[PDB]
Design a protein around this ligand. Structure first.
Ligand SMILES: COc1ccc(-c2c(-c3ccnc(NC(C)=O)c3)[nH]c3cccnc23)cn1
Length: 303
């Protein structure tokens, strides 16, 4: 018909892997689409992600464009599919490893990321209402870069949805679910109050600050920039454990280093201030995604 379905999609190239889903580039009626494939035993993970993407009023230019959840029986086994818009640049992690950005480029990446997060976090009240949503796994590998240089947040499988009226979360959340390197202090030491939904929003803010630090490093001014690094590259091993992260972040109370050259540029100074204000140990002290978006909107306007 006219709706995009799995039977009309031909896979072309392996392009990645999530926690469970295997990612492919595919072709649907001439057009490129991204496909995330789960096996029958990973039905809960596939279903949960499909459930979050189908939330009423979720679509936003800074959230990955969802196309469909479908099944495909090849005649031996059934594959569980998630289909989305395809972005040639891939993740913000890949983009930042390949390129440096201008001051304008940096602001576009940070603002679009802050806008997508503010949209997820915001309850939209109305007949076609949207619950507040916390991501729980924000990181540069979970954000995609569009051709126009703006970001879109993806991999919503670990998200939590909140109903403000009855004050309830739609799932019984497990502790320490995301990427250990990006885990907020209160997640690392398990002090997070998981009966308060605002704690999950606050934990996403800390991770966004880490992502902002990744972008800023790549901001080239007069051909001067830092090389690409993951947050805490200088303090923890590759594939760090919760204990290794906890000793640095909670006990030693270290955060990614803010270079001296970031104080020489107004946009870099604004970014450095946002980062520090995302990195307080206590979530209640952190900036909101809405406030960060407002700050970066004024800065993109000022140029
Ligand atoms: C809801 O459906 C989907 C479909 C695909 C992805 C997805 C993509 C993805 C998306 C768009 N474009 C690309 N493009 C290039 C160049 O890789 C890659 N990369 C991933 C890595 C790990 C987990 N999921 C993904 C996420 N959700």
């Amino acid at each position: 018909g006219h709706m995009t379905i799995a039977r009309d999609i031909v896979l072309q190239e392996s392009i990645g892997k999530g926690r469970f889903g295997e990612v492919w580039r595919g072709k649907w009626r001439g057009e490129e689409v991204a496909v995330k494939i789960f096996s029958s035993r990973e039905e809960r993970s596939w279903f949960r992600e499909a459930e979050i993407y189908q939330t009423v009023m979720l679509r936003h230019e800074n959230i990955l464009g969802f196309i469909a959840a479908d099944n495909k029986d090849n005649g031996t086994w059934t594959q569980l599919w998630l289909v989305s818009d395809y972005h040639e640049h891939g993740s913000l992690f890949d983009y930042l490893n390949r390129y440096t950005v201008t001051v304008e480029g940096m602001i576009k990446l940070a603002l679009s990321t802050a806008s997508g997060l503010a949209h997820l976090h915001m309850e939209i009240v109305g007949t076609q209402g949207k619950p507040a949503i916390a991501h729980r796994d924000l990181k540069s590998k979970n954000i995609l870069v569009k051709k126009n240089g703006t970001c879109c947040i993806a991999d919503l499988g670990l998200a939590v949805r909140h109903d403000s009226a009855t004050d309830t979360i739609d799932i019984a959340p497990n502790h320490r679910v995301g990427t250990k390197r990006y885990m907020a202090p209160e997640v690392l030491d398990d002090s997070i109050n998981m009966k308060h939904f605002e704690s999950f929003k606050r934990a996403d803010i800390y991770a966004m600050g880490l992502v902002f630090w990744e972008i800023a490093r790549r901001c080239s001014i007069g051909g001067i920039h830092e090389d690409y690094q993951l947050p805490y590259y200088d303090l923890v091993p590759s594939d760090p454990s919760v204990e290794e992260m906890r000793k640095v972040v909670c006990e030693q109370k270290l955060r990614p280093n803010i270079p001296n050259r970031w104080q020489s540029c107004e946009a870099l100074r604004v970014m450095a201030k946002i980062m520090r204000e995302c990195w307080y140990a206590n979530g209640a002290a952190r900036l909101t995604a809405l406030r960060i978006k407002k700050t970066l909107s004024q800065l993109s306007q000022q140029e």
